[PDB]
Structure 1
Amino acid sequence: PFEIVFEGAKEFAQLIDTASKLIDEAAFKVTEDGISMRAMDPSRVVLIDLNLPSSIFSKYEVVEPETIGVNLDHLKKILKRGKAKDTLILKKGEENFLEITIQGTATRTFRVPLIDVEEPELPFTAKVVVLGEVLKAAVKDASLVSDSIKFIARENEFIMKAEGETQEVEIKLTLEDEGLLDIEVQEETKSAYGVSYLSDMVKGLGKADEVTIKFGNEMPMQMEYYIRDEGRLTFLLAPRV
């Protein structure tokens, strides 16, 4: 059992919405230190890792640790009722359901039944930190133009393209551009990743959010952004499988 309160219902709704694009159900481990969730999509191409320390919640009371399983589509449907400034209260008692209350100027309560849900380390040579706007633009620009997007990183340049034979769209960044905050490269690095996976990964990403991307030559990419400074959502995406 526990009682957890998060200020900013919409933001929490965005995290769940994002995860639901990769998986239908997930297991959330709720301990005194915080909430964690790890999962791999059905295609075994992307791994999602979510960690929300108790420090980011305005109220965090856990009577007894527990791992609860939930259908993310059902959860998202309820959470989308929350406004940017609404407060979200999650309460779990002895029974198999989570009581969700959303309060702003008025209050609303819902139930989400629980379900039984069963089921990074690479030698990266490039690291970049960009504003979410750049990645959101990149995927929106690539969607129906190509199957994948080629990521290229050099000393003072980050490029997202797809060297091929179709109409070509490329986003280029240098440190002089506001979209690129940091770039560290050990050697020229290139890899390509699936466009539909990236579109899902950047779903609900804020345009002003700072996103760290780490990758290598023909290797997976690790994408990560923070939630309330201490929380974090991390993705590990295969370059090909």
Structure 2
Amino acid sequence: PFEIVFEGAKEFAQLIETASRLIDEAAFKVTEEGISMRAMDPSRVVLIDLNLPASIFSKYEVDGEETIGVNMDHLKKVLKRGKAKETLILRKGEENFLEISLQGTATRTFKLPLIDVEEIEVDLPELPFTAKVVILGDVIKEAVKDASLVSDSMKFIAKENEFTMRAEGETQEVEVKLTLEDEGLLDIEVQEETKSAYGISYLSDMVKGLGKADEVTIKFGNEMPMQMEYYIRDEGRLIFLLAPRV
């Protein structure tokens, strides 16, 4: 019987599209604290975590807690219908239906039946991250684009006050390097020299849709999984956990 309201339905639609670009079935946990989602891709390579606190939503009235599951394709198609200055209201009655209402000049209401999706509680604890890098969306997006242009895998090398991304192909070579003085690197900190390689397809899926004026926090180590995160409304958090090759 909960009711949840949001402002700027386009932002929520883009968030859902980014989250669903890698998974097919998702289960959202609704509580008093907020809405949470944690899932893994079919290849068991990338872990996706979504956290939306109650302070973001304009209205948030939940009495209890229950888990709801819905198909990502239908939800994405419905949410893509929203505009940039509309009000999104998600409602769930005593029936097992999810009502999606867009409030603009006229109110449009959609219905989506709930589907029973298996719940597998897996979590990744904190790991020792040797290097922490704060970067903008544009530099990483075009870097991944060039790496896909030349090669199939991307290598991240972080040293003291420097950050480079290399793409080694069969014939061609691409090197992109930037320092703290450049506007691409807002922050940087390195405990020790690190080097790792990751795939491009997963990176291309994750970085697509990122804005130009967006701050992305990238943490990674030596031959151990990379963690990418960025914040929405200064409290909402999306976490990507990508395993390295080999």
- Size of the aligned set, in residue pairs, is 241
Residue 200 of structure 1 is matched in structure 2 by 205
Shift of residue 15 of structure 1?
Answer: 1.3
Structure 1 segments unaligned to the other structure (5+ residues): none
Calculate percent identity across the aligned residue pairs.
Answer: 88
Give the Cα–Cα distance (whole angstroms) in 2 for the partners of residues 190 and 104 of structure 1.
50
Equivalent of residue 125 in structure 1, options 126, 130, 141:
130
Structure 1 residues 97 and 143, CA gap change in structure 2 (3 angstroms) = farther
1:138 partnered with 2:143: yes
Give the Cα–Cα distance (whole angstroms) in 1 for the partners of residues 2 and 128 of structure 2.
39
Give the Cα–Cα distance (whole angstroms) in 1 for the partners of residues 26 and 146 of structure 2.
30
Residue 7 of structure 2 is matched in structure 1 by 7
Residue 47 of structure 1 is matched in structure 2 by 47
Residue 219 of structure 2 is matched in structure 1 by 214
Shift of residue 104 of structure 1?
Answer: 2.5
Shift of residue 83 of structure 1?
Answer: 1.2
Query: Contact 1:136–1:207 (CA<8 Å) still a contact in 2?
Result: no
Residue 152 of structure 1 is matched in structure 2 by 157
Query: Contact 2:218–2:229 (CA<8 Å) still a contact in 1?
Result: yes
Amino acid at match of 1:200: D
Residue 17 of structure 1 is matched in structure 2 by 17
SS in 2 for 1:69: strand
1:230 partnered with 2:200: no
Residue 68 of structure 1 is matched in structure 2 by 68
SS in 2 for 1:38: strand
Residue 82 of structure 1 is matched in structure 2 by 82
Residue 189 of structure 1 is matched in structure 2 by 194
Give the Cα–Cα distance (whole angstroms) in 2 for the partners of residues 76 and 69 of structure 1.
14
Query: Contact 2:150–2:169 (CA<8 Å) still a contact in 1?
Result: no
Amino acid at match of 1:104: G
Where does structure 1 differ by over 3 angstroms across 4 or more consecutive aligned residues?
A: 163-166
Amino acid at match of 2:188: I
Query: Contact 1:152–1:191 (CA<8 Å) still a contact in 2?
Result: yes
Residue 114 of structure 1 is matched in structure 2 by 114
- Normalization by structure 1: what TM-score? 0.96
SS in 1 for 2:173: coil
Query: Contact 1:153–1:188 (CA<8 Å) still a contact in 2?
Result: yes
Residue 96 of structure 1 is matched in structure 2 by 96
SS in 1 for 2:128: coil
Shift of residue 63 of structure 1?
Answer: 2.5
User: Which has the larger displacement, 67-76 or 114-123?
Assistant: 114-123
Query: Contact 2:23–2:42 (CA<8 Å) still a contact in 1?
Result: yes
- Normalization by structure 2: what TM-score? 0.94
SS in 1 for 2:55: helix
Structure 2 segments unaligned to the other structure (5+ residues): none
Name the Cα RMSD after superposition.
1.3
Shift of residue 164 of structure 1?
Answer: 4.8
Residues 13-44 of structure 1, C-alpha deviation per residue, up to 9 Å, x if partnerless? 11111121111110100001100000110111
User: Which has the larger displacement, 224-233 or 161-170?
Assistant: 161-170
1:178 partnered with 2:183: yes
User: Which has the larger displacement, 158-167 or 94-103?
Assistant: 158-167
Give the Cα–Cα distance (whole angstroms) in 1 for the partners of residues 116 and 219 of structure 2.
34
